[PDB]
Write a protein that binds this ligand. Structure first.
Ligand code: SF4
Ligand code: SF4
Lengths: 232, 246, 50, 32, 90, 232, 32, 50, 89
């Protein structure tokens, strides 16, 4: 079942429907950007649509192909955004072509927007009735000088991933630096090529036996010292 | 925490708490596979992206003390696996779901699982709630194929009694053999260490293949669209096929 | 005994005049993460299926 | 109109290709 | 753009593979060899020692005695010694 | 070469041919039904078409794709019948989707029908000139409230079947009870669940060792008692 | 006309899909 | 599609002329995108450097 | 006259990878369970094979490798390599 309130479900029974409104939120905090709020249309005052107090500005956005299924391939709906004045290209050249971000689609009925969107003022406003979905941007299939097409995907979709992440190595580590297994917290001692530096900005392990010996954590080495198992 | 891994008895309401303990359950095996760092592709998806309550319901369903052939009492499905080869994540997920007879969907912005567990009707539809596109008939039925209806299935399972070796057990129906032809199919039951579980899996496949043979496509108005999330049970009250007035 | 680390041995039986015997020593990796011990004691070790 | 016709032909050439893929792999085809 | 023509319903187009396939995703059988004769090994059993060269470390979930992946094998001379002082070799 | 008589072959080469009538026979006797006779068109008297004495009633029918080929997959012609008044669904719900039945297509020239189909009476009547084809129904891909589509296949079609259909040993049997291989012909002694049942209405064999022992036909047991060939 | 154009486009799409399957399975391509 | 972890199989004349796998990855690509592992043998390789 | 439907395909090719647009990438062999967990090399054959199915191979540098045996035969040797030094006792 869905988290649909009783009031909106009851309203979604009558013949004389209201106007469906779709609003989009592009979240880039996890990738290094900001939160952008878009709406396909504006109110009667020629103003950004106000919902839950926040404002969605008008911009041509169109999402097509939302197909949830359990078999076959995954779902890859398409989002089209007008690229005029180079606005999309500006963030694309900066945010690595909008790869890894999140998109949230909220759909609302017209009779529940804030009262400031209507000259008479809606008395039926209720800023808690909407339907929410989230997806992740996969690629920018085409961004011309007039438009831009993004492919969407489910966050939990598996593609190109293998289950047994463990890999057996001979003289190379397998985990990160200082994360969980390299319980190192002392001063910087080494760098990429195992040089005796003492600066923290250049401290990165070489993923070798010599790096471990330098950092005195050879007891936590991921590379088994077999090597000569296939020669004999 | 609510789960006791010794007698598999639940007691009280469950919270989002966890306890590190041994287990032999199945749904929580998938949970450990899916959301685990280091080796279980936990870096791709967080803990909040998977419906743990559906997993809890599945795990509660996986311990029902079905009767076995020898007269004993054993759990329905139990995971005893040793994954020793690297393979695609989707393959392992599909194997787990096939063993559990479940299917995964991205429903309600959270990955969830649906099984063929009997439940109560959610909604009802008649001819006035659907649309005839151009041909005048809104409901569109179809059936399975004669060569597609399997009647004999051979399942491979590991036999701990003799030598921990593979063994094939076959299941068939005499009346199905009399009605249609003989359709033999092979299957590998995932993590099976008991003849009863393999027999139950084969019987479920042949039964759910012999009974459910009708699939219908139709259309739905916007008001009922979001109302039905998906993978639910309902009734299609049609007055054209029932030669009456629904 | 289970818990996280365990050891066990069987009494060596040899003697009978000075000689020199071999000693095969091998390490095996079973699985990953916190595993549990054998269902029984040191008997669970099966050399040549016994 | 153009774009409607183009989208119609594109979506029509989908299930045709899918059925061709499915039939050519059944018994004595080229297995896709 | 107001209308959406070509509804293109999909009924038996997905049934044609089988009906249990749309409720359960089936399982993958291993490939059969010839030199293996007729021992139909599956993907969750291994009763022999394997080699841990550029491979993955297997996981275990319950019971089911398994083999391993050999990391170091070595033979030395068995020195005389026990947990004590009794070292008679007569 | 076909078995077409000389006279129809001679007429088929004429410049001014006659109407080509197609008649259909659906046989479900091998399934548990009856014989249904259909014709796409009727005579000039507003009556069912009389051929060889029998009557084909005028009902919706239309076939497409009937063909003979050797390369690639086998041919699967498609039949279509209009489902009005629920007539097709009536037999579909009772005969298990009409799978496994037989369909016979007869092709005849108009100038050989029975004399009762013409007001003046056809003197060129000879009810032994027709072309006959036979197929088997495979699936019903459409049973809408307006029509019904059936897929046809060759009777000798092979797929999803293996040639050597025996599985070496098993703790269970592999023959059929009371056949020409099991050889048992005695009174009822056991049931499906191996209980002492002396009633023949529900006699069944578990195909297992104890069930076979119950009937003293262990000599004809199909399973081999090896088991330990893999363990040992 | 509707149905005639629909059947023609469907058959042409099937022919195109068959030709694509034939041409992509020669030596290289994606080896369908 | 953007790979950042690669395993290369090369023959190793030093030990026993056996195959050996060498791993290469970037930490910053791990931080920015996900981890995408890909295997490919280095055809003709006879030294770890190549 | 006009030549419509260009249908630019720059996007479709990248879908399989970008490094493949400049390098065809090396092929990889399959893994046989029977050959334990060893990985087969595509450019070296240490084992000495049988001269029949295997095509006459080619060498390109170093690589102590096996061969394809054409004739194996075991007999009784002579007592003495040559010369007049032919002592036995
Ligand atoms: S090599 Fe030693 S130090 Fe460098 S990361 Fe792996 S463990 Fe930590
Ligand atoms: S088991 Fe013995 S009795 Fe039952 S069928 Fe096979 S042969 Fe006839």
């Amino acid at each position: 079942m869905q988290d649909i309130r009783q009031e909106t479900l009851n309203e979604c029974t009558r013949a004389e429907q209201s106007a469906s409104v779709v609003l989009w939120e592009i979240d880039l905090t996890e990738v290094g950007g900001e939160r952008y709020f878009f709406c396909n249309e504006q109110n009667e005052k020629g103003e950004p649509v106000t919902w839950q107090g926040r404002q969605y500005q008008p911009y041509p956005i169109q999402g097509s192909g939302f197909e949830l299924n359990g078999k076959g391939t995954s779902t890859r709906p398409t989002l089209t955004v007008s690229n005029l004045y180079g606005m999309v290209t500006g963030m694309a050249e900066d945010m690595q072509s909008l790869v890894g971000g999140t998109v949230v689609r909220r759909k609302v009925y017209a009779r529940f927007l804030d009262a400031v969107n209507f000259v008479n003022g809606n008395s039926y406003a209720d800023p808690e009735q909407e339907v929410i979905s989230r997806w992740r941007i996969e690629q920018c299939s085409e961004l011309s000088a007039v438009s831009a097409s993004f492919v969407l995907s489910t966050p939990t979709e598996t593609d190109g991933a293998v289950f047994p992440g463990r890999i057996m190595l001979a003289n190379t580590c397998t985990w990160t630096y200082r994360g969980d297994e390299c319980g190192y917290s002392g001063p910087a001692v080494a760098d990429e090529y195992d040089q005796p530096t003492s600066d923290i900005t250049k401290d990165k392990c070489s993923k070798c036996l010599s790096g471990c010996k330098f950092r005195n954590n050879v007891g936590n080495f991921g590379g088994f010292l077999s090597i000569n198992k296939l020669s004999q | 925490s609510n789960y006791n891994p010794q007698t598999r008895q639940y007691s009280g309401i469950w919270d989002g708490t966890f306890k590190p303990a041994y287990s032999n359950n199945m749904a929580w095996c998938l949970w450990d596979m899916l959301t685990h760092p280091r080796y279980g592709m936990g870096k791709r998806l967080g803990a909040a992206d998977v419906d743990k309550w559906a997993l809890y319901v599945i795990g509660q369903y996986c311990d029902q003390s079905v009767p076995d052939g020898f007269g004993g009492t054993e759990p329905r499905i139990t995971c005893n696996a040793y994954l020793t080869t690297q393979r695609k994540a989707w393959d392992v997920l599909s194997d787990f779901c096939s063993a559990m007879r479940c299917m995964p969907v991205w429903n309600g912005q959270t990955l969830t699982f649906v099984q063929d567990r009997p439940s109560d009707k959610t909604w009802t539809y008649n001819r006035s709630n659907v649309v005839m596109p151009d041909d005048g008939a809104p409901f569109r039925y179809s059936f399975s194929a004669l060569k597609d209806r399997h009647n004999a299935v051979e399942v491979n399972w590991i036999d701990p009694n003799n030598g921990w070796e593979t063994a094939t057990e076959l299941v068939e129906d005499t009346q199905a053999i009399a009605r249609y032809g003989r359709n033999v199919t092979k299957m590998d039951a995932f993590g099976c260490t008991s003849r009863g579980q393999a027999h139950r899996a084969g019987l479920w496949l042949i039964k759910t293949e012999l009974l459910e043979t009708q699939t219908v496509d139709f259309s739905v108005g916007a008001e009922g669209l979001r109302h039905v999330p998906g993978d639910v049970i309902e009734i299609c009250d049609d007055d054209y096929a029932g030669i009456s007035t629904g | 005994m289970g818990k996280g680390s365990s050891k066990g041995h069987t009494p060596r039986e040899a003697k009978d005049n000075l000689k020199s015997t071999q000693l095969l020593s091998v390490i095996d990796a079973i699985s990953e993460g916190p595993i549990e011990g054998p269902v029984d004691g040191l008997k669970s070790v099966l050399l040549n299926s016994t | 109109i153009g774009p409607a016709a183009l989208k119609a032909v594109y979506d029509m050439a989908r299930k045709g290709a899918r059925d061709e893929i499915q039939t050519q792999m059944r018994d004595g085809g080229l297995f896709s | 753009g107001g209308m959406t023509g070509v509804l293109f319903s999909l009924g038996a187009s997905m049934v044609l593979g089988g009906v249990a396939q749309m409720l359960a995703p089936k399982a993958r059988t291993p490939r059969i060899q010839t030199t293996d004769n007729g021992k139909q090994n599956t993907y969750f059993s291994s009763l022999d020692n394997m080699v841990a060269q550029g491979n993955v470390l297997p996981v275990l979930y319950g019971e089911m005695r398994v083999g391993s992946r050999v990391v170091s094998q070595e033979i030395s001379t068995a020195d005389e010694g026990d947990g004590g002082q009794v070292v008679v070799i007569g």
